[PDB]
Amino acid sequence: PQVTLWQRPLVTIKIGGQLKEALLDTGADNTVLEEMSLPGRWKPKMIGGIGGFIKVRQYDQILIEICGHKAIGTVLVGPTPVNIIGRNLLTQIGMTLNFPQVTLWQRPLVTIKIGGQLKEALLDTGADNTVLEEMSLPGRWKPKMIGGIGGFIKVRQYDQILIEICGHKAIGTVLVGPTPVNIIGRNLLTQIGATLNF
């Protein structure tokens, strides 16, 4: 299965005897599931996203069958609004990002050029939008608000912005705000021909 990114990359997963839909998320280090019944021991953990932090129950060595491929690893359970499969499990199912091929044992970071400036950014199949840390951009913007796993942040929305992502040019909407990492989301990933393969 090669997966393009014009829509959210959702898969069916089977975990703890239950069927769920989950988001293949190259932008997430961890795997976080909405509140669900999981058996066994767990440890309290705290995880941050765009917007702040949530408390989660951490379960180790959990079997999960992702789109018909089995993996065992750590699953976090908490107040996430989308089930997300993060890199700790994506690597186990041989997931790659293609546009160069990119494995997922490390964060898929790329160099971008935008508004004359060079930045590092995360290729994030779990993000609908592109969000960049505070930076000087030219032109008008529109007040906007985006939600992450931790809640919401205020961003400035800039439309039809030119970005060169790993030497491929795209034009699209970029959001600017208090994100801790520069995020290249699906609105731009599609333009550089990014696919998810496993």
Ligand SMILES: Cc1c(O)cccc1C(=O)N[C@@H](CSc1ccccc1)[C@H](O)CN1C[C@H]2CCCC[C@H]2C[C@H]1C(=O)NC(C)(C)C
């Ligand atoms: C879930 C997770 C981890 O377990 C570990 C590290 C980060 C994250 C995490 O939340 N990553 C996010 C990118 S934002 C980010 C923030 C800090 C570091 C790296 C990425 C996801 O990849 C995308 N993330 C997946 C998903 C998270 C729960 C809320 C609904 C979406 C929201 C979406 C998102 O945030 N979209 C933006 C437009 C705001 C970028």
